[PDB]
Each structure stands twice: as structure tokens, then as C-alpha cells.
Design a protein around this ligand. Structure first.
Ligand SMILES: [Ca+2]
Ligand SMILES: [Ca+2]
Ligand SMILES: [Ca+2]
Ligand SMILES: [Ca+2]
Ligand SMILES: [Mn+2]
Ligand SMILES: [Mn+2]
Ligand SMILES: [Mn+2]
Ligand SMILES: [Mn+2]
Lengths: 232, 232, 232, 232
């Protein structure tokens, strides 16, 4: 019964529990703003400092986790949304890809759109090079920004979005429940074998990118997480 | 985009949005007690008054829902904990079975343990006749209390438990996340084709049940539900 | 080495280990409900039957105690929550003030807010005539509901709150650490000379009150106490 | 508010949330054995891997924390009970002192008994050189094993001890409540300004040592922590 669990309803620079990468910044109201509105191909990632052990090579066991968070995207003259946020899980040594071009890489993949991570994205800009659907979408990414599975969605400027992700180790099923501003929910689920795609010790976090013409305000308002791993 | 959603911090007799069946009763604190400690083979169920359309034959669409609630199961001498609580979905006409012997059935099945429903059960007494696990478990039931899949759990007398369940129509994956009082989480997921097990219109509720030797307190503390059906 | 220690997980009417006063009542699950929601200016106090000796005239020593208890306060239509719960220490011959008007007095002080007691209060209603902070708070009271020291606190409806108190005889220090639902802790400490504010023998207990337009559910879910006095 | 909060019912190698130093070993029963029974001047320390920020240079505010743990010491033929266990707070670069003689120092200071730390010791051997009271005892240490204050305490072999600590930042009051096997409790409280004795970011841990002739079994059974810093 090994269990990790933290909870932030706000943030503050200096908190050792959080690692900052890229153009990340903390607003005077505890909000985390992932990108820089004057930088080209701006990328900003935020990770939970302490690495979590999602699976043990000693017991074959994979941990389960229930996490939920709330983000918000808002438009800015005169750019076009850029192109979103992504909740990812990667190896502990994870760093913004070298020479990151932002954009469709969302700050976690290389140019080909590949990388070593598993995540859920809230994509707001269609990128033909990665097979993005023609509309805002939610997709489960496994080592590539070319989502293994997507679903129509719609990002509403200035609207707060509540997401609840559940990963059940028994079936190896990652489920996502998105509750939009107006009240409707958008779900999407996919079987993903963490023990076969990631190393025992990984880290959790959010990443947001941008481009030259495509730029917007990405904000992470709160985050609660709990990962329980059976040890027997 | 058809959406039904409600929130119950505390319940109260006389509220039209709720239906009462069996030995149900509302405590002076706004909690629903499902069984009666004095009756033999006691059974009580609470249903959300207004029925919910979870799928439409015209469209072929199935709705996805997000629901979370909290409960408490406290002990009493000289009785054994019986038998647990169950979150279920059934035909809008659903009524407590005729001659319901209580016990394992959980107030949703007959002596054979068969019925017309789909639900998650936080089972606390092991009923050998229903291929029950040797311990307190959580399980996914489909037209029977002889679970399709169970996972080792632990009910802690007098402990307030939190549960979150996500249903994804696209994959038809019912995922549950039990958050024990000590922080550990328990999870179980399963593929259940709702469209193929229940009518277009159904009702969501809670049922508990006791036996002769086994009896205990079942309290439903709070309930919030939201389902969305694509209408196109 | 004279020690007094009892551990209550749930309660029950009759048990001669607890004295009931006022509108107290016991829920079906062992929870104590200190007030009546129909009575105007209700008051309810629960005490530990057997009195405890906190200080000896001979040895001159003062006892030390470590107590912890979880409580809950839930809202109701359409009243203002009132007014809080107070853990207190008073003379073995203690009774509810003859003429208790309820309100902020919390069933321990008169209309002037004065009384012969010592306690830690969890006040939710600001009563300007007792010099109450503008927000919910936790204060150390000594012979008055007009706190000697207080701290901003947030009472959540339907949230189980856990409290741990430590009294150090050597320093005559009273340390309180409150743990809210969400995880955060609130703490208040204060130096209080019991040997000079109470009689050799006292009684420990819980007390809550209601008013006319102000009423709410006060619940004591559990309580455990342990005091130790040296005789050398 | 900034809150750090963990909880360990047991431990096990691998868990990235725990740092080991010295002769720490993890028993199959999930217990931690701090010293080695076959080494001379053995020393073993265990720490929460992530550094906690106990105060901020920005706001100036100091954090408050509530922690409780359980441990057990046990004799062995034919060595004398060595010589204690200590709960400490130190800078993030805290390591076992170079060439530690063990014993008297408890593994956290130099031969002179000095060091950089704030702790609570459970001293089971009298070291005249550090001014140890003649009997076993509990003390509050501030940068030296020559306690700033102490209180008589008996260490019963094989007896499980449960501790509760509550630091109130508004008074800088460290309060300890020790519950002995028999049921009696021991208290001790000392004012210690952490913002003046420690850096912004610190680590929490347990240490124990031994000598050539003095050796015993030091076990940590469980540990739960929770700190909260106001951020405004
Ligand atoms: Ca894109
Ligand atoms: Ca059963
Ligand atoms: Ca008041
Ligand atoms: Ca010593
Ligand atoms: Mn995409
Ligand atoms: Mn079962
Ligand atoms: Mn007050
Ligand atoms: Mn000492």
C-alpha cells in the first residue's frame, strides 16, 4: 500500500514541490501561466517535483491513480490560439525537447511529433503534420503528438475547465472526464500499458507551447493527485 | 447536446427529486440510511425521481456520465456487516424484487442473485452462493450480484468513503475510483455495453440490504451526477 | 502517575460514561447531535461523566492532556449557520447557564459572554458584541466567549474535521492543530494556567448552540482523551 | 495556502519519497531498522526525500506543521541500550557527520555534540559529556545534543511508542506529546524560532546511533506529516 498524494488550489514561486521549465510563470493570484505572450515558439512545462513510482519491477504491479485539475485558456489579439495544454507523464529526467519548436509538439515531442511520454491533450489548433482533427479536440497521446485517440471538443476563451483522469491498473485503462464551462462533459478512454511504455520512476506535469502567429494564455488553476500502488 | 445533472449535499424526505423504496429513512443531518436495523432481511433503496435517457435507438448514440458520491458503513453489536451498498442503473419501472430475501442480493436481485441492472457494489459480507470473494470487495455487476469482476477492498467502520465513476460511451468503459479514508485509492474498470443491457430510459440509485444475522448502518452522504448525450 | 483516558469511536444514550445536557441527541450511527433545529436558541452539551483532576493542591503539580476528536458542521435551508462548537473544561458541578439565550454564548456563558470555563471554540458566526473576528475562526476562550486569541478558519458544510489538542503542564501551553477536509492544518496555541482558572477537579466536554435565525447541524463523530498527572 | 502532506503505514526499499543514510534497513514487515547490530558506532538516518519549505523570505511567514509517528526500541544480549532515537529538522544538505563516533551524538552532531538541526530526542543512555539527565529522557535539541530542555521518560523494551508534535508558527512553539505503552503520556514544549535557526527549505527525518558496547534495536513503524504555509 504505497501512496503518493498532493493537492494545490493555488501556486507560489519557490514551492520545492514544483519544478518549472520554459517560459512558465506564477500569476499574482496563484495561477500558473505556461507560455510567454511575446516569445516565438514559446514553451512552458510544470512538473510535480518528486518522481512517482508508477510500477514495480519487483512485483509486476502497476499503480493506479486518480487525479483532477482545472485549466483555462483565453484569447489575445491578434494571434490564433496556440494550440493548447497537455497533461503528461514522462521519465523523471524529462526536459523540454532540445531545439523545441513549440507548436504541435506542445513542448513534449520533437519535430516529427514524437517523444517519450504518455498524456492527455487539450489541442486547440489543427496541425496537418501530426494528423490533428480539423477541430479543437481531446486526445490520448502515447509517445507522439499524433494521438492514438481523439474526440471532438471545444475550447472556450476565458472558460474554466474541470478534468478528472482515472487510471485503473487492473485493466490498464486511462479514462478522462472533461466538464466544460456550460456543464456538458466530454469523455475519452484508452488502454495504455504504463509498465510497458514508461520507466518505473516517472514524473507528472502539464506543458503548453505556442508558435509565431499562434499564441494564447494557458493557465493551470488547481491540481489534486493521488497514486496508490499495491505492494504484495 | 442533451445534458442532465444534479447535486445533493444532503437529502430530505419530501423532496420530489427523490424516490424512496424499502426501509429507507432520512437522519436529522441530511443523510440517507438505507436499511432498518430491526427488520429481518431489511432492504432499502433510494432512486433519482426523474428518469434519465442514456441512449437513443433513433440516433444509436449512448451517453457518457460522470458521477461521484460519498457514504459510510458503521458497525453494530451483535451483528455482522451486511451486506454492503450498491450504486445501480435499472429500467425506469424497477422495484424491489418480490419476496426479496435481502442478504447478498443487495435488494436488486432474486434468490438466484439475478436481476435487471448494472451497478458497482461495495460488498462487505461474503456470500458463498454468489461466487463472492473471501473478503470485502468492490465489484462490477451486470444483471446479477455474482460480479463480472471484483477487486480486493476494505470497508472501515465509521469511515466516510468517496467514490468517483466515469462512463465513456465511445469505449463503453465503466471506471470506478474509491478513495478510502486513509488516502489509498482502489480502482476497478470494465467494458459494459449499456445500450445492450438496459432500456433507453433508466434510473440511477442506491440500494442496500441486510439479513438475519447480518446487519449494519448504510449511509449515503452526498451525490452529484452529470450525463451527456449527443443529439446528432 | 494518575492517568485518565477514554476512547470513543461512537456514542450511545444511557452509557453512564457520558453526561447529556440540553437538546443533545444520538443519531443511529453513534454521532452526537448537539442541537435541535426546531427550537429557538437551542443549546446542547455532552460531557464525560467521571470528573478529572487537572491539578493538586498538595503536589502543586498540574496535569497534562492529549485529546483528539473529529466533528462536523452542516448547513440547512434557510438559516445562517450558528454558531459553532466549543470544546471546554469546567467545574464538575457545571450546567447550562440558567437562562442561556443560545447565540454566540455557545451554551457556556451568560448574556455578557462570561462564564467559569476554559475551551477551544470553532465559531462560525461573528457576534460583534463579543468582539468576534469578521470571519470564521478558532479561538482560545478563558472565562469568556470573547476569545483571548483567535485565528482565521474556514468551516466547510458537511466536512469531517479532525482536531488534536495538547496541554503541556510544564509550560502551561495549550496547542491546537485543526485539520480541514482538504488537507491543510490551522493551528492556535496559547498559554493558560489551569491551576489558576479552574478547581482541582473539572469535567471535559463538547457544547454547541443555535439561535433564532441561526441554526446548523453540529456533530461530534468521535472523541479520545488522555490526561496524566504526576504525584512525586 | 501551501501544504505538504504525506503518510506512511509501512515502508519499503524503492519508494523515492524516502532517503536512507547510514545503516538503515527495511524489515519484511515494512518496519525501518535504523542502526546495525553488528557494527561499532553504527548510525542510520531516514529522511523524506523532498525538501519542505518551512518559511518564506517573501512573506516572512513561518509554516505550521502537525506530525505523529510510532517507534519501538528493544534490548539485546549483551549490550547496553544505545542510546536513542531523534526526530530532526535540518538543512537540505544534511548528511551524517564526517567520521561520526555515533552514540552520544545520535548521528546528528560532531564529537562536541554540536550540529545544524532542531529536533526531539528520545535519549536512552546518559552521556555526561553532553549533560544528559541521569535517567532516560525526552528532550528538545537546537543545534546540539545538549538539549535546550528535557523531561524524565522511561523507555520500555519492545514497547511501541506513539508521538504527536505540533509546531504553531504564530508562537514558534514546538509541542510534543508522547504516549507510552502503559497509557500515561509525557509532554514537553519549547519555543524555537525556525526562521532563525534553519534555512527556508529543510528536510525531516529520523536518526539513531550506537557505540561499541551500547547497542539496541531502533525501529520506526509509521510516520505521517502535514505542514501548511500561509501564502499572503
Ligand atoms: Ca495541434
Ligand atoms: Ca455479498
Ligand atoms: Ca459567535
Ligand atoms: Ca545520549
Ligand atoms: Mn492533437
Ligand atoms: Mn459480491
Ligand atoms: Mn468567537
Ligand atoms: Mn539528551
Amino acid at each position: 500500500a504505497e501512496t503518493v498524494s498532493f493537492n494545490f488550489n493555488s501556486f507560489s514561486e519557490g514551492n520545492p514541490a514544483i519544478n518549472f521549465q520554459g517560459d512558465v510563470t506564477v500569476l499574482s493570484n496563484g495561477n500558473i501561466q505556461l507560455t510567454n505572450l511575446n516569445k516565438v515558439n514559446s514553451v512552458g512545462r510544470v512538473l510535480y517535483a518528486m518522481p512517482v513510482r508508477i510500477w514495480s519491477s519487483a512485483t509486476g504491479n502497476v499503480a493506479s491513480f486518480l487525479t483532477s485539475f482545472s485549466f483555462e485558456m483565453k484569447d489575445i489579439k491578434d494571434y490564433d490560439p496556440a494550440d493548447g495544454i497537455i497533461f503528461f507523464i514522462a521519465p523523471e529526467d524529462t526536459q523540454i525537447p532540445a531545439g523545441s519548436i513549440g507548436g504541435g509538439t506542445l513542448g513534449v515531442s520533437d519535430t516529427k511529433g514524437a517523444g517519450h511520454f504518455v498524456g492527455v491533450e487539450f489541442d486547440t489548433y489543427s496541425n496537418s503534420e501530426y494528423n490533428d482533427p480539423p477541430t479543437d479536440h481531446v486526445g490520448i497521446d502515447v509517445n507522439s503528438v499524433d494521438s492514438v485517440k481523439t474526440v471532438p471538443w471545444n475550447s472556450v476563451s476565458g472558460a474554466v475547465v474541470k478534468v478528472t483522469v482515472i487510471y485503473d491498473s487492473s485493466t490498464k485503462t486511462l479514462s478522462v472526464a472533461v466538464t466544460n464551462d456550460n456543464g456538458d462533459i466530454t469523455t475519452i478512454a484508452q488502454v495504455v500499458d504504463l509498465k510497458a511504455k514508461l520507466p518505473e520512476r516517472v514524473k507528472f506535469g502539464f506543458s503548453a507551447s505556442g508558435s509565431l502567429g499562434g499564441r494564447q494564455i494557458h493557465l493551470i488553476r488547481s491540481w489534486s493527485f493521488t497514486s496508490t500502488l499495491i505492494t504484495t
